Structure formats: structure tokens, C-alpha cells
Amino acid sequence: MLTLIQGKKIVNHLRSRLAFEYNGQLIKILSKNIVAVGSLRREEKMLNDVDLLIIVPEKKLLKHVLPNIRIKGLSFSVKVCGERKCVLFIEWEKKTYQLDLFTALAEEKPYAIFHFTGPVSYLIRIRAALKKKNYKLNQYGLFKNQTLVPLKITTEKELIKELGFTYRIPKKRL
């Protein structure tokens, strides 16, 4: 329904004008705390759904990151799920668009993108393939030899490297 650039402009403006009130204080969100994922990362031809990844430097702030969330110049409705799963729908004067965002910790930054780009299939194969090597991946880190080892990297590719597996392009979406 939308074009590649449509999603880019929308998301870029979304993360640029984003602000939530927590405990009465106005906490604004920007491109520094919000990253474009999903169709924005895959960059194909058409935009239908847009994903986003907001990182939080604190688990407390994470759970308190969606108290009074508001946009400046657009309407929306957010739905919190699990830990890092928040689905919202934006409304532009009777228009409606699906924006899926993940709320993660500053540490869960790579895994967030990994889960976003890779629906799950690639994660299944990697988890099952790594399982043989006693390596398991989880929303809360990877476990090897019964030892919880967190994703201590900077990006998606780096994360996959840490897992001891092969990385691919975000446009693969497996």
C-alpha cells in the first residue's frame, strides 16, 4: 500500500517526533533511541508494515517507557506485550498504518533487529543447528554448556558472529 520511501519518511518523522510522559516528566524519543526495522530494514518495493526498535538503558525504564506515549502531529494506539513487544497503529486523519515496535535494553539491541528481520524461521534453524553444539539463543541471551552468555556486541552482524554462525542481509527475512 505504501512505498519504500513512504515508510522511511513516516518512521523517520515518527522517531523524530515521539514523546512520552513518565511520572509527570516528558521523555522524548529520537533516532538515537529508535531504530527502523522490518520493511525499512528489508527495503523492498512496497511498504505494508513498518517495524521499529527502541532501546532502553534500564529495565525499569523499559517497563515504564510506555506510560503516557504521545506523537506530535499524528494519532496512534500502542499495545504492550511481553518484554520487548509493542504493537501500535498510527492514524493520519482517518488513515491507519501498522507499526510494530520492540522495546529492548541497550544490550538487547542486536537480538531485537535479529528477531525483527528474521521472522523466526532463520532463528529456528540457527537455534536447532546451534543446539547440537550446545548453543541456545534466548530473548535473554545465549546459553552454552549451561552457561548464560549475553550478546556482548554492537550490531546484528556482530551478534550473529558471536553466536558462531553465518550472518546474512536483513533483506533476506527468513
Residue 51 assigned to a binding site: yes
C-alpha cell at 23: 511520572
DSSP 8-state assignment for residue 40 = H
The single residue listed with the C-alpha cell 558462531 is 164
Residue 101 assigned to a binding site: no
Residue 82 assigned to a binding site: no
Q: What share of the chain is helix, strand, coil (3-state, %, to 5)?
A: 30, 40, 35
Q: Which of 112, 131, 10 is nearest to 53 (CA)?
A: 112
Q: Tell me how crowded residue 79 is: count the other CB atoms within 10 A of its CB.
A: 11
Tell me how far CA of residue 113 lies from CA of 44, 82, 156, in angstroms: 17, 16, 6
- State the distance between the two ends of the chain, measured CA to CA, in whole angstroms: 22
Q: Residues marked as binding?
A: 49, 51, 100
Q: Residues marked as binding for Mg(2+)?
A: 49, 51, 100
